[PDB]
């Protein structure tokens, strides 16, 4: 029995403090590649362990390869190998693209479905699972049009790093530290919040009656690029600010709808936010 382990790395598509990402070739097939940096191997041993517990398999949650750690003269190498989808990162997709009803609504409820598949548990089956980092860099396009949720290096798990999540992004229980650490429930209230800014995100880039707004990152107008904890803290937890929801969307049934359903996802007591079940009821229901 032959082991073919080679992967040729073709080109870097991702570079960060993470460490980088690239596409790569398997046996004449794309694969994905992530080589983690020393700064964060810890993001590979906890995406790592919860695979060994749990071989997630769903079409909205990016497809496991292989986790590989290769013994170096005086170094480990952590490599994360995966599903290659060319489209790139939702992020990426929304720069260029404006989409119309049909593909803002398979966005979004793909996001719901694979976001709902991370939180159930299921007895046999699967523990539940909160992600912590949910956010437009870490959702992937697919050729199809549904999309694929990326990255479980914070991701917490169910039954019974000091990496945090993305600022931006953080729910204002984890900004104003109230957060109940020991709940489970809290994890998923706080991936529902960011949840709720990508929906916002996406549908931004929605064209109705001939109008359509830049993409922005949530928050763009109120603190910096690279804002500090304390800059999203005021804005969210002090002065209780939300994204804006465009006029033009309340001329547009299914921007109506999503911008109700935003609303529903920051509310500022976690207990009161939608699950992720009755998120994907409602995105059937529209249109
Ligand atoms: C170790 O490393 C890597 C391996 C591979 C890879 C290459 N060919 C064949 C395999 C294979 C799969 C499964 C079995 C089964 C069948 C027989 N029996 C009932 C149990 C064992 C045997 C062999 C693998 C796993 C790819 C890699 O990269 C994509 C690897 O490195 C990350
Ligand atoms: C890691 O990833 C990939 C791996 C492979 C691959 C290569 N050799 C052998 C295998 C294999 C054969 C047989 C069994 C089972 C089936 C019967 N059962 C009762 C026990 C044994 C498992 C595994 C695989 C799956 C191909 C891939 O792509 C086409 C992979 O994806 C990149
Ligand atoms: C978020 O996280 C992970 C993501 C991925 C991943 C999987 N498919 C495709 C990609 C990708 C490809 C291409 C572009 C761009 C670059 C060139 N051009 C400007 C348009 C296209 C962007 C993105 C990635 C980054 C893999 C991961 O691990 C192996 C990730 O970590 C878990």
Known sequence: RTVARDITLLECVGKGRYGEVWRGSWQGENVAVKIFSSRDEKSWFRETELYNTVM???ENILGFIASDMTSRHSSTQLWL??????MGS?????????????????????????????????????????????????ILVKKNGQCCIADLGLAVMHSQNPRVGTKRYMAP?????????????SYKRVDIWAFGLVLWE?????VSNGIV?????????????????????KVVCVDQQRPNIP????????????AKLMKECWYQNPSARLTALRIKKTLTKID
């Open 56 to 58: 997630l398999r769903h």
């Open 81 to 86: 190998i995966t599903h290659y989808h060319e």
């Open 90 to 138: 939702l992020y990426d997709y929304l720069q260029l693209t404006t989409l119309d009803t049909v593909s803002c609504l398979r966005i979004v409820l793909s996001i719901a479905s694979g976001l709902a598949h991370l939180h159930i548990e299921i007895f046999g089956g699967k523990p539940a699972i909160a992600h912590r980092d949910l956010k437009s860099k870490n």
């Open 173 to 185: 229980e984890v900004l104003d530290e109230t957060i109940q650490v020991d709940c489970f429930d």
């Open 202 to 206: 996406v549908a931004r880039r929605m």
């Open 213 to 233: 707004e830049d993409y922005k990152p949530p928050f763009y107008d109120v603190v910096p690029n690279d804002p500090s904890f304390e800059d999203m803290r």
């Open 247 to 258: 006029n033009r969307w309340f001329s547009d049934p299914t921007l109506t709808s999503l």
